[PDB]
Design an enzyme around this catalytic site. Structure first.
Site, PDB file in Angstrom:
ATOM      1  CG  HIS A 188      -1.760   1.153   1.333  1.00  0.00           C
ATOM      2  ND1 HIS A 188      -1.315   2.398   1.733  1.00  0.00           N
ATOM      3  CD2 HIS A 188      -3.051   1.286   0.963  1.00  0.00           C
ATOM      4  CE1 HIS A 188      -2.321   3.250   1.590  1.00  0.00           C
ATOM      5  NE2 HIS A 188      -3.387   2.602   1.144  1.00  0.00           N
ATOM      6  CG  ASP A 229      -0.796   6.345   2.708  1.00  0.00           C
ATOM      7  OD1 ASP A 229      -0.278   7.263   2.037  1.00  0.00           O
ATOM      8  OD2 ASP A 229      -2.023   6.310   3.020  1.00  0.00           O
ATOM      9  CE  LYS A 230       1.112   0.927   7.992  1.00  0.00           C
ATOM     10  NZ  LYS A 230       2.360   1.523   8.530  1.00  0.00           N
ATOM     11  CD  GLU A 288       7.577  13.234   7.859  1.00  0.00           C
ATOM     12  OE1 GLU A 288       7.132  12.079   7.758  1.00  0.00           O
ATOM     13  OE2 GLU A 288       7.334  13.980   8.828  1.00  0.00           O
ATOM     14  CD  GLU A 339      12.992  18.216   9.340  1.00  0.00           C
ATOM     15  OE1 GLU A 339      12.426  17.447  10.168  1.00  0.00           O
ATOM     16  OE2 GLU A 339      12.369  18.720   8.372  1.00  0.00           O
ATOM     17  CE  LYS A 378      -7.311   1.250   2.001  1.00  0.00           C
ATOM     18  NZ  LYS A 378      -7.863   2.611   1.688  1.00  0.00           N
ATOM     19  CG  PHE A 433      -6.781  -2.821  -7.018  1.00  0.00           C
ATOM     20  CD1 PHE A 433      -5.775  -1.927  -7.279  1.00  0.00           C
ATOM     21  CD2 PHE A 433      -7.027  -3.165  -5.696  1.00  0.00           C
ATOM     22  CE1 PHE A 433      -5.006  -1.414  -6.233  1.00  0.00           C
ATOM     23  CE2 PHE A 433      -6.253  -2.665  -4.663  1.00  0.00           C
ATOM     24  CZ  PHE A 433      -5.247  -1.780  -4.923  1.00  0.00           C
ATOM     25  CG  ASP A 448      -3.890   6.544  -3.184  1.00  0.00           C
ATOM     26  OD1 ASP A 448      -4.315   7.692  -3.310  1.00  0.00           O
ATOM     27  OD2 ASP A 448      -3.887   5.953  -2.072  1.00  0.00           O
ATOM     28  CB  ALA A 449       0.146  10.352  -3.773  1.00  0.00           C
ATOM     29  NE  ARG A 482      -2.981  11.182   4.530  1.00  0.00           N
ATOM     30  CZ  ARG A 482      -3.142  11.799   3.383  1.00  0.00           C
ATOM     31  NH1 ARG A 482      -2.415  12.821   3.090  1.00  0.00           N
ATOM     32  NH2 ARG A 482      -4.098  11.424   2.545  1.00  0.00           N
ATOM     33  CE  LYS A 483      -3.997   3.672   4.662  1.00  0.00           C
ATOM     34  NZ  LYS A 483      -4.137   5.114   4.364  1.00  0.00           N
ATOM     35  CE  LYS A 516       7.024  11.789  13.557  1.00  0.00           C
ATOM     36  NZ  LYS A 516       5.862  12.178  14.302  1.00  0.00           N
ATOM     37  CE  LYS A 566      12.851  13.775  15.786  1.00  0.00           C
ATOM     38  NZ  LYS A 566      14.307  13.917  15.968  1.00  0.00           N
ATOM     39  CG  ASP A 577       4.295  12.703  17.536  1.00  0.00           C
ATOM     40  OD1 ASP A 577       3.444  13.088  18.343  1.00  0.00           O
ATOM     41  OD2 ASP A 577       4.649  13.313  16.513  1.00  0.00           O
TER      42      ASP A 577
HETATM   43  C1  LIG Z   1       9.426  20.159  16.973  1.00  0.00           C
HETATM   44  S1  LIG Z   1       9.182  19.986  15.184  1.00  0.00           S
HETATM   45  C2  LIG Z   1       9.215  18.066  14.976  1.00  0.00           C
HETATM   46  C3  LIG Z   1      10.618  17.429  15.148  1.00  0.00           C
HETATM   47  C4  LIG Z   1      11.593  17.845  14.051  1.00  0.00           C
HETATM   48  N1  LIG Z   1      11.161  17.193  12.767  1.00  0.00           N
HETATM   49  C5  LIG Z   1      13.037  17.501  14.349  1.00  0.00           C
HETATM   50  O1  LIG Z   1      13.805  17.427  13.359  1.00  0.00           O
HETATM   51  O2  LIG Z   1      13.362  17.317  15.521  1.00  0.00           O
HETATM   52  C6  LIG Z   1       7.390  19.936  15.069  1.00  0.00           C
HETATM   53  C7  LIG Z   1       6.776  21.320  15.061  1.00  0.00           C
HETATM   54  O3  LIG Z   1       7.167  22.046  16.224  1.00  0.00           O
HETATM   55  C8  LIG Z   1       7.338  23.413  15.912  1.00  0.00           C
HETATM   56  N2  LIG Z   1       8.767  23.799  16.084  1.00  0.00           N
HETATM   57  C9  LIG Z   1       9.752  23.888  15.126  1.00  0.00           C
HETATM   58  N3  LIG Z   1      10.889  24.361  15.659  1.00  0.00           N
HETATM   59  C10 LIG Z   1      10.610  24.599  16.981  1.00  0.00           C
HETATM   60  C11 LIG Z   1      11.360  25.171  17.995  1.00  0.00           C
HETATM   61  N4  LIG Z   1      12.638  25.578  17.869  1.00  0.00           N
HETATM   62  N5  LIG Z   1      10.756  25.292  19.200  1.00  0.00           N
HETATM   63  C12 LIG Z   1       9.474  24.908  19.378  1.00  0.00           C
HETATM   64  N6  LIG Z   1       8.702  24.343  18.443  1.00  0.00           N
HETATM   65  C13 LIG Z   1       9.296  24.245  17.246  1.00  0.00           C
HETATM   66  C14 LIG Z   1       6.860  23.612  14.470  1.00  0.00           C
HETATM   67  O4  LIG Z   1       5.470  23.908  14.532  1.00  0.00           O
HETATM   68  C15 LIG Z   1       7.105  22.227  13.881  1.00  0.00           C
HETATM   69  O5  LIG Z   1       6.286  21.959  12.747  1.00  0.00           O
HETATM   70  C1  LIG Z   2      -8.922   4.182  -3.619  1.00  0.00           C
HETATM   71  S1  LIG Z   2      -7.279   4.944  -3.534  1.00  0.00           S
HETATM   72  C2  LIG Z   2      -7.704   6.699  -2.848  1.00  0.00           C
HETATM   73  C3  LIG Z   2      -8.412   7.629  -3.866  1.00  0.00           C
HETATM   74  C4  LIG Z   2      -7.519   8.000  -5.046  1.00  0.00           C
HETATM   75  N1  LIG Z   2      -6.443   8.924  -4.546  1.00  0.00           N
HETATM   76  C5  LIG Z   2      -8.259   8.641  -6.200  1.00  0.00           C
HETATM   77  O1  LIG Z   2      -7.568   9.331  -6.988  1.00  0.00           O
HETATM   78  O2  LIG Z   2      -9.471   8.451  -6.291  1.00  0.00           O
HETATM   79  C6  LIG Z   2      -6.744   4.464  -1.888  1.00  0.00           C
HETATM   80  C7  LIG Z   2      -6.145   3.074  -1.861  1.00  0.00           C
HETATM   81  O3  LIG Z   2      -7.077   2.120  -2.365  1.00  0.00           O
HETATM   82  C8  LIG Z   2      -6.401   1.110  -3.085  1.00  0.00           C
HETATM   83  N2  LIG Z   2      -6.792   1.162  -4.522  1.00  0.00           N
HETATM   84  C9  LIG Z   2      -6.131   1.766  -5.568  1.00  0.00           C
HETATM   85  N3  LIG Z   2      -6.752   1.512  -6.730  1.00  0.00           N
HETATM   86  C10 LIG Z   2      -7.817   0.707  -6.415  1.00  0.00           C
HETATM   87  C11 LIG Z   2      -8.751   0.057  -7.205  1.00  0.00           C
HETATM   88  N4  LIG Z   2      -8.824   0.158  -8.546  1.00  0.00           N
HETATM   89  N5  LIG Z   2      -9.665  -0.704  -6.560  1.00  0.00           N
HETATM   90  C12 LIG Z   2      -9.631  -0.847  -5.218  1.00  0.00           C
HETATM   91  N6  LIG Z   2      -8.762  -0.241  -4.401  1.00  0.00           N
HETATM   92  C13 LIG Z   2      -7.845   0.495  -5.045  1.00  0.00           C
HETATM   93  C14 LIG Z   2      -4.899   1.342  -2.890  1.00  0.00           C
HETATM   94  O4  LIG Z   2      -4.517   0.622  -1.725  1.00  0.00           O
HETATM   95  C15 LIG Z   2      -4.860   2.848  -2.648  1.00  0.00           C
HETATM   96  O5  LIG Z   2      -3.703   3.258  -1.925  1.00  0.00           O
HETATM   97 CL   LIG Z   3      -5.571   4.776   1.463  1.00  0.00          CL
END
Ligand SMILES: C[S@@+](CC[C@H](N)C(=O)[O-])C[C@H]1O[C@@H](n2cnc3c(N)ncnc32)[C@H](O)[C@@H]1O
Ligand SMILES: C[S@@+](CC[C@H](N)C(=O)[O-])C[C@H]1O[C@@H](n2cnc3c(N)ncnc32)[C@H](O)[C@@H]1O
Ligand SMILES: [Cl-]
Ligand SMILES: [Cl-]
Lengths: 380, 380
Positions: A14, A16-17, A42, A55, A166, A235, A243-244, A249-250, A270, A274, A276
């Site tokens: 998938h 996203d995965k 990311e 980063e 899915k 499919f 699909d991007a 996103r999961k 991460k 982090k 999270d």
């Molecule tokens: C803390 S950053 C996430 C971790 C980061 N990707 C890293 O490289 O450690 C998440 C969010 O916190 C905020 N942020 C960025 N720099 C920060 C800073 N110096 N102090 C506090 N919050 C910050 C921004 O809103 C950012 O999108």
């Molecule tokens: C349905 S697509 C999301 C909507 C899509 N971005 C669009 O442009 O309509 C989300 C997920 O469904 C699955 N998918 C992609 N094509 C499909 C298809 N033809 N039938 C069923 N599921 C599909 C894939 O796992 C994909 O990442």
């Molecule tokens: Cl999806």
């Protein structure tokens, strides 16, 4: 007293995965060389493209081309006929150092146990006694259906299968004094990418007989169970081409399938600073420890942090009425038994170890006896 | 009977929120010309870069450079000194048509009312009588703190402010027969990007006196309230330069702040056929209708779909014990009063209207009397 509940899961291919797995392959590559790497990677996937953005500050020397391509190979995207090929895709890198302003506020010149949270945020842990592994049956079954598809793809049983899938499972439950008891499977959805040659009837028959029946106990399936198997009808286009994909996103597939709650943060890509990730893992550990310890049957744990501050700002316990003890009493037990500073969590849960790619498909919880799945013996 | 609960929000220039807003600016641009545009636009932001990735099939002619740059301008990133500039950033586009395989399975040659869900998935709606707008106080306050920062930035009161901000509010609640009653604010976090010249003490004083006191009623603030204001100590680097942004990475900020539940799907960049958005909006509408209708004080609604299938696979109601009616009875009332097919939701909630960029900061719910916020009068 009965109700329905639905959860989904997705397969290794998938889109996203794919991104989650690549992000964690990058994390692991760094950690293999530098256990203290600061990683916020990311991944973005679309037709022919893996982009890394984020980063990283690390002493490691990582070959991103190799790491990304090997991850995609493992997933199974190895030919243009499948829509994506690790050998020939574009790998683009937009990685910079960690912001110095974040570094100075979080970890520089701090004792490890006293490092600050890497961000603010809230996180939840959840556990339910409805399965031995303390996870909702809905999501366990959904994950296992995707794993079965990958197994039958890889062993050549169903060679028309492709990596993108899915699944979705609706269970009918009975309420039981705040706990939940599965009764039956009400509806199953499976959608999986396939080759151009196989017909719908062959696929639907195989999905029922070789996938569902191999995963879901017969006692849960009956004449009323509804099956939506390849419900789109076609499919062939799939993976990032269909699909991007993006990292993070999961997040509900990664956790509890709609049960419990979520604080919003993604896990993959991460390092332990982090919260999270690390605090969500610790909150799972707390929840599972309460259930396995016999203090409750079902429980939700919230924690929260401020960037730069080590101790949690808040901790909350919700037991759904499934304990003789009050939620206040359970919170006291938690506070006496756990230290949820990130610089302590890292030690308890061994979070510098490069095992993260293993967490990035089929859920982070309820599997493989990771440290957060081994309950703590509680004193009270 | 008391407990803590924490929620967060982020500002318009938080990098994930930038992406959500750009994705919805793109959606709106398409819908202005083609009400039936099929849009799945992801945005990625890092230093100097906005990338659009995804799938759009539309009769519109959209100037992506202009749409993206105007969105960034509105947010306030207009100079290299702030870390990002709409005039001079890179805008990259990786947009293709919607997969024909999806189109044929979802909407081609289908009556609009009978179009299939654009994907499988699960979605939740939630409402709570603790505020007039039926939202959790924790997240309402968190959003309002970010809005106040943007207001004082834009009116030149605090001209050291920059667009990237995060806030977090912990409230102490009392349990009340399944409903919740706010008592006090326990902890507030505010982090906001700032210029190189202003000192920490000036910022912390302003954040307390001009932001918090202007937003949070004094009755909730006391000698014990904890304030973490600029807790990292320095936040000059910010926006995408400080942290990569992606669409759909603030899904809890977009919804209920940890309360209720989430099915995992992102809202921004998606037209109505993507049930991740339309069904979540409808589920909010149901929840709010139940509370405003006097049927319960607090409620969680689940719905789920299969790709290509119009009617929901499951619908569930959880009322926390806050109704005299059973959850079964409430579900019957819901089924008699609502039709949650996406091709009906679109009509009820006017989901071809290009208002989506307005939803993409400060939460999608509890504001501005959008159609999903106007309760339906229920017959029972
Ligand atoms: C803390 S950053 C996430 C971790 C980061 N990707 C890293 O490289 O450690 C998440 C969010 O916190 C905020 N942020 C960025 N720099 C920060 C800073 N110096 N102090 C506090 N919050 C910050 C921004 O809103 C950012 O999108
Ligand atoms: C349905 S697509 C999301 C909507 C899509 N971005 C669009 O442009 O309509 C989300 C997920 O469904 C699955 N998918 C992609 N094509 C499909 C298809 N033809 N039938 C069923 N599921 C599909 C894939 O796992 C994909 O990442
Ligand atoms: Cl999806
Ligand atoms: Cl963030």
């Amino acid at each position: 007293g009965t109700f329905l509940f639905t959860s989904e899961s997705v397969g290794e291919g998938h889109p996203d995965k794919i991104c989650d797995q690549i992000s964690d392959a990058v994390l692991d590559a760094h950690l293999q060389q530098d256990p203290d790497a600061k990683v916020a990677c990311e991944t973005v996937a679309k037709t022919g493209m893996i982009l890394l953005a984020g980063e990283i500050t690390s002493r490691a020397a990582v070959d991103y081309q190799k790491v990304v391509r090997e991850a995609v190979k493992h997933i199974g995207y190895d030919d243009s006929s499948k829509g994506f090929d690790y050998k020939t895709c574009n790998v683009l890198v937009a990685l910079e150092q960690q912001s110095p302003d974040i570094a100075q506020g979080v970890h520089l010149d701090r004792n490890e146990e006293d490092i600050g949270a890497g961000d603010q945020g809230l996180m939840f842990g959840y556990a339910t006694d409805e399965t031995e592994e303390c996870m909702p049956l809905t999501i366990v079954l959904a994950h296992k259906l995707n794993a079965k598809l990958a197994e039958l793809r890889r062993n050549g049983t169903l060679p028309w299968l492709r990596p993108d899938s899915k699944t979705q499972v609706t269970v009918q439950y009975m309420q039981d004094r705040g706990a939940v008891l599965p009764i039956r499977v009400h509806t199953i959805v499976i959608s999986v990418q396939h080759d151009e040659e196989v017909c719908l009837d062959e696929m639907r028959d195989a999905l029922k007989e070789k996938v569902i029946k191999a995963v879901v106990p017969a006692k849960y399936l009956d004449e009323d169970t509804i099956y939506h198997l390849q419900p789109s009808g076609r499919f062939v286009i799939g993976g990032p081409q269909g699909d991007a994909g993006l990292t993070g996103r999961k997040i509900i597939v990664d956790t509890y399938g709609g049960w419990g709650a979520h604080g919003g943060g993604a896990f993959s890509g991460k390092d332990y600073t982090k919260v999270d990730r690390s605090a969500a893992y610790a909150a799972r550990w707390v929840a599972k420890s309460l259930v396995k310890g016999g203090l409750c049957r079902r429980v939700l744990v919230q924690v929260s942090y401020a960037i730069g501050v080590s101790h949690p700002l808040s901790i909350s316990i919700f037991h759904y009425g499934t304990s003789q003890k009050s939620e206040r009493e359970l919170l006291e037990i938690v506070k006496k038994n756990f230290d949820l500073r990130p610089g302590v969590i890292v030690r308890d849960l061994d979070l510098k170890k490069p095992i993260y790619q293993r967490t990035a498909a089929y859920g982070h919880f309820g599997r493989d006896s990771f440290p957060w799945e081994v309950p703590k013996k509680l004193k009270y």
